[PDB]
């Protein structure tokens, strides 16, 4: 079902795409996994600890 949902839109069914380095414009081998993860910010800030 995830693959079918990726195929509905124009997206690669494998999940991995080819990226390019930002500092040299060169291309990484072994295409990497790119997507959207839901990240959280925990209440342990460095301002209250230094």
Partner 1 sequence: EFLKPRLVDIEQVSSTHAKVTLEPLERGFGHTLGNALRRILLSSMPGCAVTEVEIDGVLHEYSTKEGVQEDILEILLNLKGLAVRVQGKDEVILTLNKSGIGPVTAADITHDGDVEIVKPQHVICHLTDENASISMRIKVQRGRGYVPASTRIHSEEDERPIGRLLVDACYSPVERIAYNVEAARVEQRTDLDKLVIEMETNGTIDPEEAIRRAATILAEQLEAFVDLVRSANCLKAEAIHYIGDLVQRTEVELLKTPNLGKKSLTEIKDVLASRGLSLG
Partner 2 sequence: GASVGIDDMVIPEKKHEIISEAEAEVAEIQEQFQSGLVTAGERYNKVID
Partner 3 sequence: KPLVGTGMERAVAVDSGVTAVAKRGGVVQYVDASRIVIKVNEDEMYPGEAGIDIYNLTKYTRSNQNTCINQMPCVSLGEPVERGDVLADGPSTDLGELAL
Residues that bind partner 1 (CB under 8 A): 22-25
What CA–CA distance (Å, rounded) separates 14 from 7?
Answer: 10
Size of the site for partner 3 (CB under 8 A): 4
**Non-local CB neighbours of 19 within 8 Å, separated by 6+ positions:** 27, 28, 31, 32, 34
Report if residue 16 touches partner 2, rule: CB under 8 A.
yes
Scan residues 6-45 and list those touching partner 3 (CB under 8 A).
Answer: 36, 38, 40, 43
Shortest CB 36 distance to partner 3, Å? 6
């Amino acid at each position: 079902e995830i693959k079918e949902l990726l195929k509905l839109g124009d997206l690669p069914t494998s999940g991995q795409i080819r990226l390019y380095d930002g500092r040299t414009g060169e291309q990484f081998e072994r295409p990497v996994t790119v997507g959207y993860m839901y990240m959280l910010k925990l209440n342990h800030l460095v301002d209250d600890k230094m």
